[PDB]
């Protein structure tokens, strides 16, 4: 009665993966050349979708992306398009009952174009329906459509530049203390509803490069919170993403690195000092983290 | 009694320009090798600044950037540092009171680290003070420091992708219309107080790819407003910049590209159409413009296709 095959003669795939590039933040469309096979090369071919196809987050039902489908140069929907028989330009030369090749295109993207897709595994179906002249001289081809957006987290300077791998704290010889390093930062994330968990991988210390026993503690605060080896969580809501501004980038958070003696009033031993702040930023429950080692130096001059 | 010249023997410049790197968002330091001339090559040289030097925006005095000044390896402040004469390592071999060469580093950075500075012209003075034995006698060398932060404007997709080079408009045979292309865009600028001026460079048409006479008009709207070859102004405050969000970036602005057939109610001629939208965005009163040329395609399919 009616069927739709690859232009080969091969059966259409039951399933289809749409390759994602993190670089361009798009899915590559699935593109196949097809032919209609029929007994009846005189009736209008009526092409529709059985429902509106959606890629849906396989772990979360609120997170959707519209699938687009075209066939024969025509955007398909739940409303049927009719192709005149003569247009599909059937052969009966020696393959009798087979249309010219028509491209099937399966595309996906976010519902608001220009915005990035959420981290996740996505699943849906394209139910393609072809009839002659209505009735049920009918075929349904279902194609499973899956995609994958790998969870991703970056920490950048608020200007988009990489964080310094090396930082120098000035010493005030009057107050006997250090001037704090302060850099404005933003988290760039795929998964903007998840907690951000921030720790230090180890307790940081400035060490006298000539005297292994002369340490002074470093203090690190981020986003207004004093950090340590014990993880502190930041609710996504208290970080200031927007669903209508700079999508998937937090508001500016101040990174603050300082140093002082363990006890106030101590005269810091004259010398050059060094140490490494290891900053760990983890995406809630996505198995993704970013790690920044920052070398911290200082000189104590009398 | 005490003065400071270049290592050559030439006088210090009265003025110095800081080249700004747009890529790294910082300034190329001015570095000059200097020698101290004196009558008393055996004393403490006391080196200090008269004032705290700022680069200040020359059309706005609330926009400031700190100057750093070093000499001999030491960062200088309004508090004086002493240099032991022995340390400056003076000659009297046939130059009778002249130091070993010691480098003057004039630098500046943005007010807040990790933040791009505003487009503008900045001016300040380094008022370098040197003293013999911290007594009655001294020398002031003033160096004017200017820097320029060049205006920049980029138009991007809201996710930070580039705009597409190419756009395909679907045709609906039932309503006899095109489905509009929509994309969310943001303006990135360092000159965030200026008007953004938006026009089309040419009046855009979908033309039949094989016949020039057969054409349909392309409509373009950005940020709610229909674009033409006449420029339209958008006030900076309307575009929803923030002094404390993602700085230098507008709120999202929808670009909408459509086409209508030449006469309403009439099926466009069957065939394949192509044309260019040349979108020009200009920063108000600056030079700096961005142009995005988008190719707009369309396949028309009437009578052949129904409902």
UniProtKB/Swiss-Prot annotation, chain B:
Chain's role: Fimbriae (also called pili), polar filaments radiating from the surface of the bacterium to a length of 0.5-1.5 micrometers and numbering 100-300 per cell, enable bacteria to colonize the epithelium of specific host organs.
Subcellular location: Fimbrium
Gene induction: CFA/I fimbriae are only expressed in the presence of the positive regulator CfaD.
Record-given protein name: CFA/I fimbrial subunit B
Gene: cfaB
Coiled coil: none
Subunit and interaction comment: CFA/I fimbriae are rather rigid, thread-like filaments of 0.5-1 micrometer, with an apparent axial hole, and a diameter of 7 nanometers. A single CFA/I fimbria consists of about 100 identical protein subunits.
UniProt entry keywords in alphabetical sequence: Fimbrium, Plasmid, Signal
GO cellular component, one term: pilus
Family affiliation: Belongs to the fimbrial CS1 protein family.
């Amino acid at each position: 009665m009616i069927d739709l095959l690859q232009a080969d003669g091969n059966a259409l795939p039951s399933a289809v993966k749409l390759a994602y590039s993190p670089a361009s933040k798009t899915f590559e469309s699935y593109r196949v050349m097809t032919q209609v096979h029929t007994n009846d090369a005189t009736k209008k071919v009526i092409v529709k979708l059985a429902d509106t196809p959606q890629l849906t987050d396989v772990l979360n039902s609120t997170v959707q992306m519209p699938i687009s489908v075209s066939w024969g140069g025509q955007v398909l929907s739940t409303t049927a398009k009719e192709f005149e028989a003569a247009a599909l330009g059937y052969s009966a030369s020696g393959v009798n009952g087979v249309s010219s090749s028509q491209e099937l295109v399966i595309s996906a993207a976010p519902k608001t174009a220009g915005t990035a897709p959420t981290a996740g595994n996505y699943s849906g179906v394209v139910s393609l329906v072809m009839t002659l002249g209505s009735d049920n001289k009918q075929v349904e081809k279902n194609i499973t459509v899956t995609a994958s957006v790998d969870p991703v987290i970056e920490l950048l300077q608020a200007d988009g530049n990489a964080l310094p791998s090396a930082v120098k704290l000035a010493y005030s010889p009057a107050s006997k203390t250090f001037e704090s390093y302060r850099v404005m930062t933003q988290v760039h994330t795929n998964d903007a509803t998840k907690k951000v968990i921030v720790k230090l991988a180890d307790t940081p210390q400035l060490t006298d490069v000539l005297n292994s026993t002369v340490q002074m503690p470093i203090s690190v605060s981020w986003g207004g919170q004093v950090l340590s080896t014990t993880a502190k969580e930041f609710e996504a809501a208290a970080l200031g993403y927007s669903a209508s501004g700079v999508n998937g980038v937090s508001s500016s958070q101040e990174l603050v690195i300082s140093a002082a003696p363990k006890t106030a009033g101590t005269a810091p031993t004259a010398g050059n000092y060094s140490g490494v702040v290891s900053l760990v930023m983890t995406l809630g429950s996505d198995n993704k983290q970013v790690e920044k080692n920052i070398t911290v130096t200082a000189s104590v001059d009398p």
